Ligand binder design. Structure first.
Ligand SMILES: [Fe+3]
Lengths: 475, 104, 206, 224, 189, 72, 215
């Protein structure tokens, strides 16, 4: 469309912003002299100036005739050009009546404290419910001392000992996990001034004040709150085109914690919003998910998401209901029973049908023949079918797991029946032995598990549809 | 720094060494039994499952994980909905399971 | 070989590339000198080394065994304003709203930096007694997003900034992120929209 | 055409602890509305002119509940609840009911506690049921005929809102309403007292026995 | 020899008209060109000046209706003129296989479908004009930047769809023309 | 003439270019007076799974690990 | 431990519309019982004591699979919101700021009233009705939730909440929600509270248009 909505499209969608360019006098002349023509007389004003400014001695004349000395004529080319915004004005909403209660996330996991001491501390959290009127706020005691803060004093003593003990441990770990320093990391090494607050000293709800020490175009402003870990107000993109005219380096600001996070996983552990000034009318692009760390120690990509509370990797919808479906009847142990049963008959028929092969058949206490180890089975053997070599299965089933006594007595009983049935001709009814009964029994046990799992889904689906809870897990 | 136990990460609520008063209120006696030996059972639970391993081990491995949890006699594991684990059984193992839907 | 993700996105989806910013894309400009003092600090009332800052009135405690009224400017500095719309621009602070219900809500503790500067910007020896004019930003005035061309000098024979776009504006340093200017004449044909992912060999303008 | 059958007992004579206003309000303002709205839904043909069991199963299309379900199921539940109450409901089971209860739920001293807890820890407004187990889930099976043995147990199940036992497989033999309107007038917001004294004396065991025998007969009919 | 693949060309006109040719070379040398003339109808010029066919019908599955053709920017380009140009997909845009041009090669009068004619025209349709081979498949996957398993050495509907998309997009700014002499477009026997 | 750029990553405008592509369904813009086109260095990658992947806006990763291979 | 937050008015402030006994039972017993259960549950676990109220609500409710904590915490949060969503002798037409947003996103105040009444009437069982903002689209919307579900769980900022559980309207209105919802929308809503909540939500959601430079 026209250049009022098409320009709007570039800003809102593609992030366009007319950032000012600091052109050198040689590059400044190029832009102001290519409009006229290829090789024409330069009569356009403000173009002769660019041509005349290529001589440094003329720049000296221009600045001295205006003044400003040196070291300021250089710094006046970095000024914002365009609609210079009127300056900020920060109102309030009444008195800043505040409590002083210990952070809820105390003690840190691993730290040990007498629970009776905390049970006295935790009453302070329970008192953050009553409200205060302007009446009883005119009754200011105003005596400069005699403050009844007692639970906070107990927390300070416990916190103070915690700092003096684990400080050496914490600094060593920050040297181990994180290689270099970036805003939001542990203030280790030469930059650690004794007395900085630690992470447990903070909690959402607290209102802080600090100085703006770092502006990042893609991350925001990092304000030194007063702890080992800096703050982080998320501002990104072209919102800085207007915000940078209100927030400048060294400014003292008042901030409030929105959420503190784990420094190991999340990149910036402290999230704050500007309470003084207030730039909530200028923020348009916001982070959907707080930034995190993708370290080599994270081997599973489905544990990483549970750590940061992110949606899982979506899978293409199979389309099946997963409510009407064949019930599973196999059992994992049957695939070993087939190997156990085969090994029994492979040794039995080589022991009783041919007794002289191993002189004596002492299967009641028979020991092993070859040394066996549990963690090797590569049995494919390249079995040939008179055509080519295709894998088959002849696996190791050392007698340690083999119970020969049960089959030893049973086979003779079955062998007696077949030899006595040659005379009369009665039908030899032998179809299932001890092992083949366990195969059907274990398949029956696994059926019961699959029976009730599909049975509980009938009640579960109905309940989650009468209320509104999801059926398939999100993503 | 202690990494959060894989036990709790998936919100599996285990009650190691269950007291006997707990069981009678929960009625573990009338629970269908399940047994196996040297095995490897991959399962994709669609329903919550309360387990009472009676003898053995489980060495449960979640799908894609390179670590493992471990269990034994006297546990009250609560394998949750939509879980995808890779139960690796060794030696004999018995259990009592009571699949539960939304509520109780 | 580490890097930071950079998702173009912008609530737009045509082919959805994404960038990786490494230490080889962005560098730091050496230390310089500039002013970094702009504050409205108050007077401390240190109690248990936790700070009880209050500027105008005396120390203001309260009953119920726990409170510290550290109030500051408020609607006493307003003149027939409105409490609803028409206040979004230059918005208020700690907007829990007090107008109608007329009951303050006690916020949480002021755990923060302590600060000092009893002599302001004259800690050792300094003064600023002159006319109201003649005051401007020092050599940090290079703001965010500013595109710096080659050979541009911050000071007289100083650091000689390189090409790129200012990424970080720290007290005495700047991150430049690098770039590459391409001068384009009238009647030229730019190949690509804004933020178009340019590969190694594809054209830019004819 | 579905009618609002009055309770099978005088309301006044059932007021040693259960006020008449509860009878007037829960039935006649909820039940009346349920029946009237059901009828207005099936005034037209809708392939549901005069079916038995108030449709219910057809409306419940394996989820995706049709608008008539939330009314038909609730009307059936209220009718079942009213029949499962007697003017004087103490006592204990007898014969077959006691034998089955002892076989399944330990002793009768434990079944009442289990049912009280089942009806006491339901969040929201739902129903509690003692129901008869069944089989024959759906297509795709295994030895599902399960050559094994008499399973056919009794189970206590709680359902939210209008969800009903027979929807999946089961056969209801006893119900208790735990919606907030069934006990608010007499007990404000304490379910356990209502459940305890309801089980003390408000329930007719003969109706439970009749439902149990009907369920067993129907099961035998299915098996043949 | 020139390797099999897709080559775009433009040889201008005496009137001052740009002719955007989309020639395709198989392993044997079967040319099925595609052209646009100021947003004109894409046509599979067989040979000389005859059989100016416009449709992209399948000899199996080609979803000529919609829902798969709308894969790049727009499938309209004079959508079947009066919404059908004749009639719609069914089996063919007039049935009888490949619309009415099933058997239009040469005849003494009016052509009628026959086994010998069908086999003779199979070379021009499928046999001798869609056997790209290994080199042809690689070149087509390179120029059009598609994703097909390398063992598939036949003409797929997506191949022609992407060819038409590139042909129409060449005029609309972005695009480039191939060189007939570049060694990356030649092979050695 | 053509340019054949010698870097990787985006472009900037910042003034004196029409914010409207001539020959719609295209990528060609025109410059009224003159300007500078910048190419902010970066490492571009193509991936159609970004909107629902695990690598969000500003995340730190090694470009040889599992998280990277989920994308590219 | 999150001690009880008193409602901003006495228990007899809304007597012509909400009886004093109703306030005594709803807040003195029910809300206190939910909070006491939450306190007992918080005593045991120490990784849930270090969670904010919003974080506790959002975590104890898993991605669809609530823990044995979601009911009590969500009920406590919902009842806090409900108590703060009234004012003595309030209601009627809205004030500045909120009215323009409602008109832009709904069409008019009567349209909002009709939609709110309708969406309150189409709830079965026990639940809540809400008028909430919506991120990523910046539009006011009327939504419904069952049992103890809150619109917070999917990144929506609640602005107005109304209790539709039967334990609210049974001491004076018995078995009809028409009178209860009409009374709430007429003489019980707090447009001041909704305006304050919208102003606070403006910090996290920007309902406006950017100042694009002319260039
Ligand atoms: Fe009821």
């Amino acid at each position: 469309e026209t250049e009022e909505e098409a320009r709007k499209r570039n800003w809102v969608e593609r992030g366009w912003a007319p950032w000012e360019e600091i052109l050198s006098p040689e590059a400044d002349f190029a832009r102001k002299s290519l409009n006229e023509g290829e090789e024409v007389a330069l009569k356009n004003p403000d173009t002769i100036e660019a041509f005349k400014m290529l001589k440094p001695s003329y720049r000296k004349k221009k600045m001295e005739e205006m003044g400003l000395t040196e070291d300021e004529y250089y710094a006046r080319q970095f000024d914002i050009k365009g609609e210079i915004l009127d300056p900020l004005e920060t109102y309030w909403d009444g008195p800043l009546v505040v409590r002083h209660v210990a952070p809820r996330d105390w003690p840190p996991p691993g730290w040990e404290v007498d629970r009776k001491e905390l049970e006295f501390i935790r009453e302070g959290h329970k008192m953050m419910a009553e409200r205060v009127d302007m009446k009883e706020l005119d009754n200011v005691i105003r005596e400069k001392e005699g403050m009844c803060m007692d639970r906070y004093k107990v927390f300070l003593k416990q916190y103070q000992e915690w700092v003096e003990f684990n400080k050496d441990k914490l600094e060593e770990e920050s040297y181990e996990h994180d290689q270099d320093y970036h805003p939001g990391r542990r203030k280790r090494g030469k930059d650690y001034e004794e007395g900085m607050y630690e992470l447990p000293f903070y909690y959402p709800g607290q209102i802080c004040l600090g100085k703006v020490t770092t502006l990042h175009l893609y991350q925001g402003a990092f304000v030194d709150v007063g702890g080992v870990y800096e703050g982080w107000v998320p501002i990104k993109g072209n919102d800085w085109y207007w915000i940078r005219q209100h927030i400048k380096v060294g400014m003292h600001v008042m901030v409030e914690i929105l959420a503190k996070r784990d420094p190991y996983r999340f990149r910036f552990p402290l999230e704050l919003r500007f309470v003084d000034p207030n730039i909530d009318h200028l923020l348009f692009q916001r982070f959907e998910y707080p930034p995190i760390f993708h370290r080599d120690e994270d081997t599973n990509l489905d544990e990483l998401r549970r750590d940061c509370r992110r949606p899982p990797f979506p899978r293409k919808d199979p389309g099946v209901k997963v409510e009407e479906e064949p019930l599973l009847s196999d059992h994992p142990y049957v695939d070993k029973l087939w190997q156990i049963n085969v090994a029994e008959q492979m040794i039995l028929d080589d022991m009783e049908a041919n007794p002289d092969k191993y002189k004596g058949k002492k299967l009641s206490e028979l020991t092993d023949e070859e040394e066996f180890d549990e963690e090797h089975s590569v049995e494919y053997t390249k079995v040939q079918y008179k055509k080519s070599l295709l894998p088959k299965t002849i696996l190791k089933t050392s007698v340690k797991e083999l119970d020969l006594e049960s089959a030893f007595a049973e086979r003779q009983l079955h062998n007696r029946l077949q030899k006595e049935a040659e005379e009369r001709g009665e039908d030899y009814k032998v179809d299932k032995l001890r092992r083949n009964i366990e195969m059907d029994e274990y398949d029956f046990i696994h059926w019961r598990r699959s029976f009730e799992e599909r049975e509980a889904l009938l009640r579960d689906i109905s309940c989650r549809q009468a209320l509104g809870l999801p059926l398939q897990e999100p993503g | 720094r202690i990494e959060k136990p894989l036990e709790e990460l998936y919100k599996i609520r285990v009650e190691r060494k269950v007291s006997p008063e707990r069981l009678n209120e929960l009625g573990v006696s009338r629970w269908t039994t399940w047994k196996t030996g040297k095995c490897r059972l991959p399962w994709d639970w669609h329903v919550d499952q309360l387990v009472y391993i009676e003898e053995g081990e489980v060495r449960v491995v979640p799908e894609g994980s390179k670590h493992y949890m471990s269990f034994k006699a006297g546990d009250l594991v609560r394998y949750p909905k939509w879980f995808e684990a890779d139960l690796w059984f060794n030696a004999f193992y018995q259990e009592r399971y009571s699949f539960r839907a939304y509520g109780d | 070989n580490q890097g930071t993700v950079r998702t173009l996105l912008g609530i737009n989806k045509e082919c959805q590339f994404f960038l990786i910013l490494s230490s080889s894309n962005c560098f730091r400009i050496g230390p310089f000198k500039g002013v970094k003092y702009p504050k409205e600090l108050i007077k401390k009332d240190p109690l248990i080394p936790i700070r009880n800052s209050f500027g105008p009135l005396g120390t203001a405690l309260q009953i119920a065994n726990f409170f510290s009224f550290y109030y500051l400017i408020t609607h006493n500095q307003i003149l027939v304003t409105n409490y609803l719309q028409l206040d979004n621009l230059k918005q208020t602070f700690q907007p829990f709203k007090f107008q109608y219900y007329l009951m303050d809500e006690n916020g949480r503790i002021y755990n923060p930096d302590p600060c000092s500067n009893i002599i302001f910007n004259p800690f050792k020896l300094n003064w600023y007694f002159l006319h109201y004019h003649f005051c401007e930003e020092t050599s940090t005035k290079i703001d965010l997003g500013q595109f710096v061309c080659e050979n541009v000098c911050i000071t007289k024979k100083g650091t000689h900034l390189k090409s790129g776009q200012v990424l970080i504006v720290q007290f005495d340093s700047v991150v430049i992120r690098s770039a590459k200017p391409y001068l384009a004449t009238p009647g030229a044909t730019l190949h690509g929209h804004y933020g178009e992912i340019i590969y190694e060999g594809d054209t830019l303008v004819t | 055409k579905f009618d609002l059958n009055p309770p099978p007992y005088p309301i006044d004579a059932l007021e040693p602890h259960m006020s008449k206003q509860t009878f007037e309000y829960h039935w006649g303002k909820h039940h009346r509305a349920y029946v009237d709205n059901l009828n207005k839904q099936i005034v037209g043909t809708e392939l549901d002119g005069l079916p038995l069991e108030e449709v219910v199963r057809i409306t419940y299309n394996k989820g995706d509940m049709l608008p008539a379900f939330n009314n038909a199921a609730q009307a059936w539940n209220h009718e079942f609840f009213w029949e499962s109450m007697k003017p004087g409901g103490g006592g204990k089971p007898s014969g077959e009911l006691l034998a089955q209860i002892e076989k399944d739920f330990g002793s009768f001293e434990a079944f009442t506690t289990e049912f009280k807890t089942a009806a006491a820890t339901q969040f929201g407004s739902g129903w509690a049921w003692l129901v008869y187990k069944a089989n024959k889930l759906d297509v795709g099976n295994a030895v599902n005929p399960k050559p094994s043995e008499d399973d056919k147990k009794l189970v206590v199940v709680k359902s939210p809102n209008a969800v009903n036992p027979l929807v999946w497989d089961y056969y209801p033999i006893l119900t208790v309403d735990v919606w907030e309107h069934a006990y608010y007038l007499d007990f404000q917001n304490r379910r356990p007292d209502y459940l305890s004294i309801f089980m003390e004396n408000l329930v007719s065991w003969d109706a439970v026995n009749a439902r149990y025998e009907a369920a067993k007969a129907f099961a035998t009919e299915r098996e043949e | 020899l020139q390797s099999p693949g897709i080559y775009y060309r433009s040889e201008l006109d005496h009137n001052g008209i740009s002719v955007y040719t989309g020639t395709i070379i198989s392993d044997w040398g079967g040319r099925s060109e595609l052209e646009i003339d100021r947003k004109a109808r894409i046509w599979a010029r067989v040979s000389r000046k005859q059989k100016i066919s416009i449709l992209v019908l399948s000899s199996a599955m080609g979803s000529n209706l919609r829902e798969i053709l709308d894969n790049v920017c727009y499938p309209e380009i004079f959508l079947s003129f009066l919404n059908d140009k004749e009639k719609k997909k069914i089996g063919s845009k007039e049935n009888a296989i490949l619309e009415f041009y099933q058997q239009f090669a040469c005849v003494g009068g009016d052509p009628v479908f026959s086994e010998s004619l069908c086999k003779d025209l199979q070379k021009k349709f499928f046999q001798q004009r869609c056997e790209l081979g290994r080199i042809g498949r690689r070149n087509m996957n390179r120029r059009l930047n598609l994703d097909i398993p390398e063992n598939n050495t036949f003409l797929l509907p997506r191949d022609i769809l992407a060819a038409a998309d590139h042909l129409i997009g060449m005029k609309f700014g972005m695009g480039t023309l191939d060189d007939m002499n570049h060694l990356k477009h030649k092979r050695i026997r | 003439k053509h340019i054949y750029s010698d870097s990787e990553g985006e472009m900037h405008w910042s003034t004196d270019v029409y914010h409207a592509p001539e020959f719609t369904y295209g990528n060609v813009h025109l410059l009224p007076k003159t300007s500078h086109l910048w190419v902010l260095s970066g490492k571009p990658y193509r991936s159609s799974v970004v909107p629902f992947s695990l690598s969000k806006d500003q995340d730190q990763m090694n470009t040889h690990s599992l998280s990277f291979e989920q994308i590219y | 431990y999150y001690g009880l937050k008193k409602p901003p008015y006495n228990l007899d402030a809304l007597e012509p519309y909400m009886s004093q006994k109703t306030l005594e039972s709803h807040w003195g017993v029910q809300h206190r019982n939910y909070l006491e259960a939450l306190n007992r549950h918080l005593s045991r676990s120490d990784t849930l004591y270090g969670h904010t109220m919003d974080e506790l609500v959002k975590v104890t409710y898993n991605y669809g699979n609530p823990l044995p904590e979601f009911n009590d915490a969500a009920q406590v949060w919902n009842h806090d919101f409900f108590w703060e969503s009234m004012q003595p002798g309030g209601g009627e037409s809205p004030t500045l700021g909120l009215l323009q947003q409602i008109e832009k996103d709904f069409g008019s105040f009567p349209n909002f009233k009709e939609k709110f009444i309708e969406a309150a009437m189409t709830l079965f069982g026990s639940g809540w009705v809400w008028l909430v903002l919506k991120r990523k689209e910046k539009q006011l919307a009327v939504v419904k939730t069952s049992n103890a579900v809150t619109p917070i769980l999917w990144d929506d900022i609640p602005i107005i909440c109304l209790d539709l559980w039967e334990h609210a309207y049974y001491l004076d209105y018995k078995n009809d929600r028409a009178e209860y919802v009409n009374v709430f929308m007429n003489h019980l809503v707090s447009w001041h509270a909704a305006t304050a909540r919208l102003a606070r939500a403006q910090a996290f959601v920007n309902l406006g248009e950017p100042k694009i430079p002319v260039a």
